[model samples]
Target: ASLTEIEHLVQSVCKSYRETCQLRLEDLLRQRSNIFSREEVTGYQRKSMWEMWERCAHHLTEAIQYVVEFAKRLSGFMELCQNDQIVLLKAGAMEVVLVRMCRAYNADNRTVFFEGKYGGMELFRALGCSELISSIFDFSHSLSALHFSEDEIALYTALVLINAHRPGLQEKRKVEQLQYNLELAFHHHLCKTHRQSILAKLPPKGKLRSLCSQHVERLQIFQHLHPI
Candidate 1:
């Protein structure tokens, strides 16, 4: 249903935004050698460097804005899901990307190297550095958000344990314990009243389940990029 439709729309929007970023990156790479060429550089050409940097910055800002809009729309969808575990997990993952993109933009603004006083290569280097840290913070924040619910935490934790290359007794035992804890948490915390309220806000069960499954699958596909 409605939830499925909304999820599909949001995913489509996200895909578009990502494609835009890829296009921008391609454009940047195309100009990379030309901009860095140490040929007979003149004062006028140097002056235009600032304008070029400004244009790139503006495009980056636009990309960040697109991501933010998508995040807001996704959050609205999550609210409609009435805090469904699957919806929350998917939203959490999306939030990580959105937040990291925002942080990357903010970091770019702070970097003196991108001010055009330095060369274009310096600006590119600064951006690369920012991306590394931004990516780490993205996963950290997403994982933190996913831990808010016991079932999600358990599922993700178990997934990690099961896939671990160096599994240990403690990890195995913890996964077992989490499975038990998840059942108790689901039954005790998600009582009849809470369930009724959630169902009331959610789309038809079929639609909601379909949407949830799609998001879960998408997240699973991307899960390898981030540690649980």
Candidate 2:
């Protein structure tokens, strides 16, 4: 089946699982309340303790749902083999998948925070999948004599951009800039090896790398603004 189909399947499972969890939590809370009411000595101390436990249980249930949603969406994105699997196998597939995956990841990241249920573990798992896909692309580049394709350059450039802008990573401008330069060198080397001009009539295949370099230059200003 296609990746979209896989995503739908996962989402459906998430909906069912979340609903079931919610029901169970609700049942537990109801039983707890009933027990408290029936107790002959339902003093202030007992009531307060029960309420505290209720809140903790609620928080735990919410946390689980939050993580479940993220995992579900991530699974869906992976289902689109174009974004997860095949894209890594093919050279030019990087550009198409990069745009698609980046957009989806950004959206998911925003929603998780907007919903006020950000889970670090869930975020890390999603990133792990991205790294897996990246490793494949990296291997493909290593095996081929070609320096780097636009898609390949775009892939790493997008990673850098995500790392810089995304919530988790601690800001380190100099380090990010260095990485940008390294990726750029790879791009240039690839173009030179292919005997392609930096600015040829038929756009240099390393065009994305050149473009990414320009992007990093602009980002470097952020580092200067807040010096280490």
Candidate 3:
């Protein structure tokens, strides 16, 4: 019932969520970039384009799975009505993945760790969605620059998932209550750590909002052009 307990829970969940991904920037500190060096593609040609898209699709699937586990493990998530659980997961999974991506980012080198490899922005050029990829990398770079403690990131992610405004939620008040708990926990955690600036910028609003929308549109563009 205490705010400290809630903070502890969020931190533990974040730790486990990081563990589940099997990739960490810390673990890869000594390793060099892989995608550009190994994959020897002269241009964004047909085969390479499809391969990048497919590899990215696979990584998104993995992130979605981790989000599901993260949501279910949260304190009040399962107690929410079943439909609301589905709604929140559907709406928030990618946003959560976007948050999680910063952990996989190597800001110093401008690369993201995916598929057991470090890849620069160039690696994603084949997808032909340069703007979207650039935005994502920029977001990752800035977020990593803040140097958030894992628990702070955990609290932020909790706030992201418990948003009350998501459409189709069957129990908006309950979700709002959960959102409140997360907010209190986040506020107290930041105060304890003397980190308040992190508060103003997010639920990671406007940026994540546009990024998710752009992501869906780009996915449709990929599907329309490459229909399997």
Best by TM-score: 3
lDDT by residue (tens digit), candidate 3, 121-209: 77666788878889889888888878866677667876788889999988999998889877877787788789898777544596787
lDDT tens per residue, model 1, 1-228: 244553443344344344333234333324333332344234325444345445554643454444444334422322322333233333343332332322222222222112223233234332223443344344334334322332222222222212212222224343344334433433333362254233233223233234333434433342332222
Under the 3 Å rule for N, CA and C atoms, how many clashes does model 3 have?
0
Which lDDT tens digits does candidate 2 get at residues 95-168? 22222222111222221111222221123232223443343233333323233333333333333322222223
**Higher-ranked by TM-score: 2 or 3:** 3
Query: Candidate 3: global Cα-lDDT?
Result: 0.73
RMSD (CA, Å), each prediction: 18.0, 21.0, 3.4
lDDT of 2: 0.32
From the highest TM-score down, the ranking of the candidates is 3, 1, 2
A best-first ranking of the candidates according to their lDDT comes to: 3, 1, 2
| Model 1 segments more than 4 A misplaced | 1-35, 40-45, 48-57, 72-120, 123-228
Q: What root-mean-square deviation over C-alphas does model 1 reach?
A: 18.0
Give the worst 10-residue stretch by lDDT in candidate 1.
Answer: 158-167
The candidate 2 region of ten consecutive residues with least summed lDDT is 105-114
TM-scores for every candidate against the unseen true structure: 0.25, 0.20, 0.85
> Model 3, poorest ten-residue lDDT window?
219-228
Evaluation by lDDT, superior candidate among 2 and 3: 3
